[PDB]
Amino acid sequence: AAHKTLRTKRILCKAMKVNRPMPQFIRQMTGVRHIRNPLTRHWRRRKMNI
């Protein structure tokens, strides 16, 4: 960046909208506990390698 391609930009979009906390209502629905979002990361710690 800048000067990213479009299909590069498509991946970086999907990588940041997927990065969030898990919703509250799944724990209320299924009753499971201790499920983490796997595709959470931090930009500084883990690099994507894409």
Place this chain on the structure above:
Amino acid sequence: GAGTPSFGPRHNKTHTICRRCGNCFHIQKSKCAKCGYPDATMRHYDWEKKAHRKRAQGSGEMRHLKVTFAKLQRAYA
């Protein structure tokens, strides 16, 4: 010499995302190391029988193929 200082100028990318594999496509050599694109046949060897069955059928959706298993259950039961 060969350690921390020489890690500095490591900014170029040897491999790039591959269309068929989507995973390690060699930019200079232009071949997907994992799948062999663009060779029409897809890369696997019998020495990597472990790593092959991660890629091969069953791993994905099987949209067309799962309904053709399900027919053959009904006909013989």
Place this chain on the structure above:
Amino acid sequence: VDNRYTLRRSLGFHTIRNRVAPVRTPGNKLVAHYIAKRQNGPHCAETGKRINGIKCVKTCELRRMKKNQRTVSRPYGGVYCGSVVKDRIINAFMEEEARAAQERKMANEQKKKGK
């Protein structure tokens, strides 16, 4: 005062196309303005000299100018300058005149056998 100024275009390096000059604005702010390229303009074949009566601008913006200012009026107007055209007239006359006089010569010489 601080009179230092950034490059505006996203190319960093100091190539021939990316060259700047500092300029005062209306607003008392120094700023990069980019230098358009130099043009040599039409030299001649033979010798290798500058022809007169035409600007060295780009040949693309030479099209936008009038058909007057694209050329010089003579035969071989753009390509050849003056004295080289004089020499071509003198040689291409006397090459053809010697060849024409050769046809007069071989007409006149062979008639001596009859008389």
Place this chain on the structure above:
Amino acid sequence: GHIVRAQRRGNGSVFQAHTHHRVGPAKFRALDASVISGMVKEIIHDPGRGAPLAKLIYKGFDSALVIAPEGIHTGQFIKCGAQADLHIGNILPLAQIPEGTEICNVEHRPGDGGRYGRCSGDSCRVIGHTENYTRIQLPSGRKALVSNICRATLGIVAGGGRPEKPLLKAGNVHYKYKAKRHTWPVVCGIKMNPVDHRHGGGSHQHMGAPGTVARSARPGQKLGLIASRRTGRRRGT
């Protein structure tokens, strides 16, 4: 052992000719049946080759980068053909030319391009006319039957006496082999270890083995003096 620097020139990755600024292949026009006049448009210098080239025009204008005899000038009229007279410039078949005279860029086969006697300050000499085969002496000493129909430029090639002046500095030879090809600088075989070269190894630097080898000797093995019917100081003869 490893593969030796003599063997590694074949595979041809870094050992290719630096052929970028070279202006073109120096040869005659093709044969095509008398006499044809040709103006020297200009004489130019191409990199690598020590001789000049002279670009001719056989005016359409058909071009030909012919290699340059000495005493050619710009806007001379060169005359390729049989019935062209003798000047330094002109391109005659070997039927027509007198014996005991110096010629340049002589062809082996007719209509070829030009083969023997091309480098700067060289010339094939003509011995005598047999019948079909005009016998000529090449610059080395060797003598060659060549057919009388095939062509040769008249006179000696330009740029003579370039090795008369030595190159004092390693830098002058760096710029010499930049135009040509990578083959320099040369590390000597004794200096290298035994795996790298045949002559290498040992506590004290020395060759050890006879250092003079057959035509039958293999790749890897042909190093040093190949099939040397004499050695040492060539005193007389």
Place this chain on the structure above:
Amino acid sequence: PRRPAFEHKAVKPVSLKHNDYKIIRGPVTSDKSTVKIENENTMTFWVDIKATKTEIAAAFNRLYKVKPVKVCTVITSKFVKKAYIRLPANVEAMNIATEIG
């Protein structure tokens, strides 16, 4: 020249599919778009990612019956297209926005 003996694909589709209604998804609700409506007379919309400015200008005209002056086209970090559509001087952008709501 070529002429096939039968149609290959006989079934034509039922509607346009790539429609005026499915180019323009709907308006964007932010604090920036609120200012650009009031000040510059300039709307904002989420758009299809393959839609051009020529497609948007015609599609905006067919729905709301106002021919736009300019269209300027972002693709966001969310990877959906945003279209800043300037309306002309006569119509007010608040009056078009109140109809939609």
Place this chain on the structure above:
Amino acid sequence: PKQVTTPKEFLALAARSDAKWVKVKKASDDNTKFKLRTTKYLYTLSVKPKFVELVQNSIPESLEVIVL
């Protein structure tokens, strides 16, 4: 943005059916500038206060005139 010397040539440029407005504007040395807008260019006309009164009348009636 070109300048035009002659007051006669200005009135030829005014009556083209290109021009959208003329702008009257006071200047230094008690002059004034009549800035004719055209689609391409902006034709200015510097004048002295002798012939200032006549030129405004000369201008076509249809063309709008914005005073500053």
Place this chain on the structure above:
RNA sequence: AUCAUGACAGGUUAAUCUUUGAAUGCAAAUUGCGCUAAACUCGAUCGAGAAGCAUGGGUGUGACAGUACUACA
């Protein structure tokens, strides 16, 4: 939504079937660069979309090339 004009996390079959991939209009680290008789569909004669257009080989159909063979001029 209830003795049915029939609820939905049920099970089939048929539609619809985004960008890709043998991937196939030509390419590709690019949302790059093309082509088309009618019909289709909006668009007001003429634009657009929709849908076409790969290589190899088989049988048929047509066209071109030849001082290849031959007859009649």
Place this chain on the structure above:
RNA sequence: UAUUACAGAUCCUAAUUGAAGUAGCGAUUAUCCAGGCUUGUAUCCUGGGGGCUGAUGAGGAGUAGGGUUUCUGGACAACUUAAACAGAUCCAGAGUUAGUCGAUCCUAAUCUCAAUAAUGGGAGAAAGGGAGUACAGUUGAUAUUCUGUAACUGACAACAGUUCGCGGCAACGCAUACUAUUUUUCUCCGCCAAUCUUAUACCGUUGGUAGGGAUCUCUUUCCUACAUGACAGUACUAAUACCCAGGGAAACUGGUCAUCAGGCGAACUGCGGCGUUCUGCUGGCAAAACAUAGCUGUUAUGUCAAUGGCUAUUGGAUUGGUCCAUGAAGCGAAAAAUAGUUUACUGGUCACUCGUACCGAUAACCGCAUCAGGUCUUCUAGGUAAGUAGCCUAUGGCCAUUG
């Protein structure tokens, strides 16, 4: 009937001791005092001292790479070698606007298919080639992209008015088509050295007026400000290159910093020709912008006059030297010649696609990490001095660092 009894295998996996509240809390300029917000600050903010960085700066900006780190609001379980209301941390929302900047288009080194009835096609550069944009304003984050104002380039349409080739001895000037073939030019090219000169910066002699700083004494003082974009025009001043007309050169003359030039035509004269630079005068243009003064958004005045650089950088001009080194191609554009077909020229609409935030090492890249390492480039102030050294200081940025 058996995957059947453990203290050891530098055994395997999982948890946990002593050492030990010990080693240690580094590197980076320097902190101090009063307020604000709070249960709570040396640390977060304000004000005032004292300092540091000291134009290759922890300044302002970009390639490659990172990928939301950018912005506003709320939050402190953890992390940022103590503390914390702070943060590049956590949470919720928001943000990247182009016919003119790039990509796209062309080829280079190089790679890959096809044909041989062929003489190629395609790929390959976000530093090469490459048509065309500038100023001012605005947001919490975007701007050569938005708004205002002024340009410019290309393609596709009809339509109105002109026009059917002339000037100069000459150099050349002025209003003229299209297809094709061939030929030539621009694009277009190494490195080094010298001289001259615009622009920008800086230092200067001469004054001046606006505001602010300083004052026991002295200083008609000190500081800030004194500015005009792309683009378009036509004056004569005066340059050097080259060419033309006259002129017709040894008692050789003219000329450079330097080499030099000339009967293949020098000096020299023309209110010669022409190209590139230059000075002045305008348009753009004061309506904007900035600084004072006053009124509640806007009204006043003002941004002036003269003329040097022995200083530097940049663009350009005029030249020289050097090489067994001679320093890209292609697309594209124009011209000319030779055929043939001819009337031409000047003056509404539209401009697709994709990138655009921020960092660029100083904590945002690579080194497992907020690592004294490493990694390409840009704008470059004053004084001292030979200085892009070292040392000191305005603009800008800072107290990075447990007490």
Place this chain on the structure above:
RNA sequence: GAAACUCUGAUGGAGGACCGUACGGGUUAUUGAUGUGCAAAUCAUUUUUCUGAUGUAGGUAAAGGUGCGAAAGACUCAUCG
């Protein structure tokens, strides 16, 4: 000075010339500091080079009994007889 030429001063700016800058290229010495490092090769002072056989960036070529090597068995992703 009879000549062939050679004395003095300026002009000029050649050289793989010299001194010397850097967030340039190298890495000599203190066998300094560090050695539970800031660092799986660093830091300080000193030293070498600084228009060139120069440094450097991107693209591109060469692949494991091979490659490449101004040659140390060097280097070929902290790995190399």
